[PDB]
């Protein structure tokens, strides 16, 4: 190791909290995969 270099000069940043109403719509899904055999196994 023992190395590190500068990329760019200093920059101006600030902290800000964003409050937002979010609606969440997510439908589940099922694999339901059939294994081998006569068809009884999964």
């Amino acid at each position: 190791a023992n190395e590190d270099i500068v990329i760019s000069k200093t920059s101006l940043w600030k902290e800000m909290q964003y409050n937002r109403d979010i609606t969440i719509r997510f439908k589940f899904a099922n694999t339901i995969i059939k294994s081998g055999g006569l068809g009884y196994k999964w």
């Binding site: 101006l12 940043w13 902290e15």
Partner: protein, 48 residues
């Protein structure tokens, strides 16, 4: 012979024209305002 002093003073408005001639040939540049002040000290959040 004092006419030289009198005319040098009188015909001085042409100095402005010479200045404009120099200015047009001068290279121009612009500067943006510098964000001043005692910037607030904000560091990393407490993490684990």
């Amino acid at each position: 012979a004092s006419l030289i002093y009198r005319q040098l003073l009188t015909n001085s408005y042409t100095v402005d024209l010479s200045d404009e001639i120099q200015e047009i040939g001068s290279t121009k540049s612009q500067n943006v305002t510098i964000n001043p002040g005692p910037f607030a000290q904000t560091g990393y959040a407490p993490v684990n």
